[model samples]
Target: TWLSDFPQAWAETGGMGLAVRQAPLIIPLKATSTPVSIKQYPMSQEARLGIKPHIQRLLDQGILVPCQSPWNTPLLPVKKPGTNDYRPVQDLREVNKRVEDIHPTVPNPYNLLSGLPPSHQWYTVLDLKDAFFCLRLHPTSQPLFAFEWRDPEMGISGQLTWTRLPQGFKNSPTLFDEALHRDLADFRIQHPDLILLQYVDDLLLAATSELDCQQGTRALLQTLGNLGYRASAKKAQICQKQVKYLGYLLKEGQR
Candidate 1:
């Protein structure tokens, strides 16, 4: 019933989130950094065909926009396991080296799990879909992620960059974690009784009873949707005595 109660929180109806609560991320470059343009790698016909629809979808969503940027990265087509499908993977190594570093705020699984108490038995786990895309990238920083794209059949050829935070950037995890933390600060303060642990896009809410977890999950989902964050309803484990989180199976507060 949580899905129906907070329809906007689920990715199926909500589509992609845009974190309007936080300011767009302005990525700083190293003092001596210069624009680096890497040539796109050649792809086979099959690979090109496989990635076309994906690129088109992103274009339609306004996630990717045509640009003439000085910086360029190569996009590789990676095959899906047990399927003929392919997904585009950007190589951001050069960009990562040129960007200024930030303090890593994402806690490890051990540190995050340590926060759980034995008294908290009921759990609700949620994984935010396309979590990094929720945060917007500053206009000045958008050019830093440009990648060359060409489709002969579609008569499209140009450099496209992401409007939101793109994956493969080294600091994406830390940046997203901090942004979500700031956005959820008020929620934490308001629900002092519920134990909520956030790891980048993954969320775990622990409660003393099933009723409490059900109520807390509803509130959490509502707040997340209001803040422009969509959680995967299919992957969510709501009000369960046992749940898997961060690659660890947790039950009775034990992993």
Candidate 2:
């Protein structure tokens, strides 16, 4: 019911979210950093075919754009379990070394769960879809994530880079967590009665009763939609007395 009520909050309807409230990520490079260009590794024909569609989808989504950047990373085609499918994962180690470090602010699961009170028995969990992709990358920072691309059949051959925060970047998780926290600050202020725990993109809302949990879930979804964040409806655990969060089974305020 909440899914239908807040259609814009679910990936099924809204596609991917864009955090309009937050500024695009501007990657700070090390003072002595210089452009490091890595060549693409050789791939099997099957692997190349499998990775093509995924790259096309990202390009179509405007997440990937054609570029001739000095900073290039290898894109590995990782095979899917029990399937012939492959997914592209960038090797960003060199780029990460050139980037300036930031304080890791994401809390450990144990400490984050400590905030759950005993009175809040009912819970709802929502995992945001493509959480890092929601945050955009500044044009200057975008070139640092470039990777080589070649598709003979498609007549496309050039370097492509992510316009959004690309995966495999060392600081993406921390940056995304902080950006989401800033965007959701008003929601926390508005709902003092509800206990909303945000660990990166995964969100858990705790309430005293099932009715309260349902209401709180609806409000949370609506607020997330308004702030341009889409949660995966399929993965959401709504209004449950027992639920799994942060890799632990939770019930009666106990792990």
Candidate 3:
């Protein structure tokens, strides 16, 4: 695993409950014009049992914090594809309708490969694990993500809000992309000789030779580590001359 080679490049929780750099605070936008809050739907007993550990994990990691919020959303325990275990999904339709969205203009994927050096034969890919969770949710905006949950038998009901950006957010993709881009701006400048490309949460490094690719990959990972971004071990393709990238196969003289 690349993490074994550079342990600092990855984390156990993958930045799930953690925040990025201290901030002037990047807050989620919600409409004060006509505020919206939906009461949570009751969870089935089966669903509750399935998601109990998941909820505990989120709380233990600080991803979800006990909160008192006027804006409430439903908590859904969805079964993962091909798995019996459930994933906690916050039904944020009502929130999405009211929250101001940043419709990000994504660059063309094919264009990401346009400027690669003709001589480049080595490649590496970095996938940010649980990418959206890396950024912190501003305290003022935390309640906007509150979801309802109740103790199975204790009959306790309350809200648990995200302290970090949660999945299913309408603006999360844009927010995370912009944050990571800004964080890596200096690193990009420092390694102008290498070809670096970013697509939302994934990064690609291309170089003319194996040694150069390895060096650049190390530098990139180290920079991300210091910034608290953890790369996925299963998705990384490091210092390879031929590999699949951006859904395209590439080899010595062709892509």
Candidate 4:
């Protein structure tokens, strides 16, 4: 019910497109390495057709943009396990292997959670909707994500690059985690009474009472909105006595 106060901060699915308002010099890759241009893997006509929608959606979201780059990778399509679903993937293993790592890292969860007091009783969980997409990819680093694609039906063909922190990138998790950390630094200090934990895009908030949780959750969601993050309604469990967090059930501060 408290979440209703910030409807704009919630999305059932998809990105809220809360722009991070890039400062031009934030967490850019030190890509002094030579650029790679991998050949496109062959795709069947049906396969290309099946993946067109996903590609188009990315294009529409500004996540994908027309580009010419020395960095290129083949597209890999894989069927969703145990289902008929199929999705396109950019094979970036080789690229990621060669790229330098300079972004902040997300440490082990167990180590981070060890600091929480066992006396905390109330709990809340927030799943950041479209986490990576909420943060923009530095223009300098965008070309590193280029992939080739073509649509047989529409006669469209070209290479496109991700304008946001693409999902499958080797550094995305840390990049996003650090970006969120910087954004919430002030709020975290302000709410010292609130226990906040983050893993990639998942946010866990704990307090000693229902009202504290409601207040904390409301502030967290509002801060997320102010900073362009959207809380997933389906995955978000607000103000609960017991909830599953990071595969562990937490209630009254006992695992």
Candidate 5:
């Protein structure tokens, strides 16, 4: 259990923004001495492995690199019970109506990848490791994430526990895709042998034939590695025209 119950709860009684006075005590104080309450807070297990230094070690080993989110989305606050030592829920009924952005060219990788011709090679995909954990969360949303499991990679401060999670959040996929798109935006690539598709961290690079497809794959992987991130080669599939990528159809490159 990462959390313990507080002995007492706090309440202002008066509704939001209005002031309310505290009720008087039924009994008078007995000797004029005040009592102080103390609780034994448990030390985090994270101190044992040290997440930040371990990440640095991993970098030295060339295992991973830092990542950034594409969409740059913001997170919302969570509400807890009155006894939960938290604040009351604010009504979000009308405030944040900003919709998530939709990509015109590649809305989803699977749609374009699945409909590809068998004779033609599809795009290659690259799965970037630790994509979500690559970037730090915005200063505001940090408190809402405060998950208590204590992952060793969460770094030195417990404050990091409030950082973002990928799949657990609704806007993760679109947000992730935007980040990858931003990275590759400057290529202006016009070669028939090169194909690019992305969904969050999973990137798909496709071409007309097996030889050209593999080459395209290598180029993208090298680019990602150079950018401080590594792609997972194991989960990657090659020499295929009709594979599941962000659930889209990728056409074969060779005619």
Candidate 6:
């Protein structure tokens, strides 16, 4: 999911676009904001021609620092003096130290488990506006991510232009998610049944009854409102016997 975030962010920025393995273009690219055509939507050929080449050029140079793979794998970029082949080095010492060492155990297993029908099928998904901005980074960590269209190399620190945020870093999501979970614990609302299904600013709610679901969702939204975190109503979903909150088909039907 972290891997998908960057491309999604870029895409949401009026089809800034992605190159590799772009699939299921659920939304059409605007003709005005981007060069992409309007005949694409809900499923269409991904418009990646412009985006791919741009990324490729930066990657070819030592400027675009990539962290190995999208699966949180880190690749060490090797700067060879006389070679065109950009190979990755094998010094895993720092990698090991930098790595989280262990995958966090979810005390609440939101994804992998199936909720019982008494509370399962009835649920709501709420979107948190400006979710990432809810977090601030360390001063030292900020410089490592100063990249953009004009200066892709990140140029060893200078006048920083891109200010809203430095995303695509490894720790951003985890920190925000953790902080959300902590706030949920502190808020203590209709969430006696709250499970924090997935906390990347996307909040999901499940309740045992229709009334409970409504109350629970309202309570949760109110709590977020009280905390100054606005929820997107246009993106919000109400009570349902069958709802797909996240990717899994959350329905009251037999699988």
Instruction: Count clashing residue pairs per candidate.
Output: 0, 0, 0, 0, 33, 1
Question: lDDT winner among the candidates?
Answer: 1
Error of 2 at 41 (Å): 1.2
* RMSD (Å) of each candidate, 1 decimal: 1.0, 1.0, 2.4, 2.2, 20.0, 15.9
Better candidate by lDDT, 4 or 5: 4
How do the predictions measure up, each by TM-score? 0.98, 0.98, 0.89, 0.91, 0.47, 0.50
Evaluated at residue 94, the lDDT of candidate 5 is 21
- The residue-by-residue lDDT of candidate 5 on 1-255, one tens digit each, is 001111111111111110011111111223442322122133334333333344355445333233322112222233245322322122211212222334444355446445445444555555565565444445344333232212356543322222332234434455555555666665426444465656667766656667777666555554554444445545656556655565444444422
Sort order, TM-score high to low: 1, 2, 4, 3, 6, 5
Better of 1 and 2 by lDDT: 1
Which segments of candidate 4 are over 4 A away from where they belong?
A: 13-15, 21-32, 81-83
Residues 135-214, candidate 3: write the lDDT tens digits.
88778888878878887767335778887878888777777777788888898899878988888787888887789888
lDDT of 4 by residue, 36-125 (tens): 899997898767777888888988877788888999988987787664567888788878877777635797878767877876678898
What is the alpha-carbon lDDT of model 1 when measured against the actual structure?
A: 0.92
Q: Please give the RMSD of candidate 6 to the true structure.
A: 15.9
Candidate 1 C-alpha lDDT tens digits along 99-179 = 999888899999999999999999999999999999999999999999989886664558999999999999999999999
Query: Which regions of candidate 5 fall more than 4 Å away from where they truly are?
Result: 1-110, 114-119, 149-167, 188-193, 241-255
Question: Of the pair 3 and 6, which is ahead by TM-score?
Answer: 3
- For model 6, state the Cα shift of residue 163 in Å: 6.4
lDDT by candidate, in order shown = 0.92, 0.91, 0.77, 0.79, 0.41, 0.44
How many backbone overlaps does candidate 3 show? 0
Better of 1 and 3 by lDDT: 1
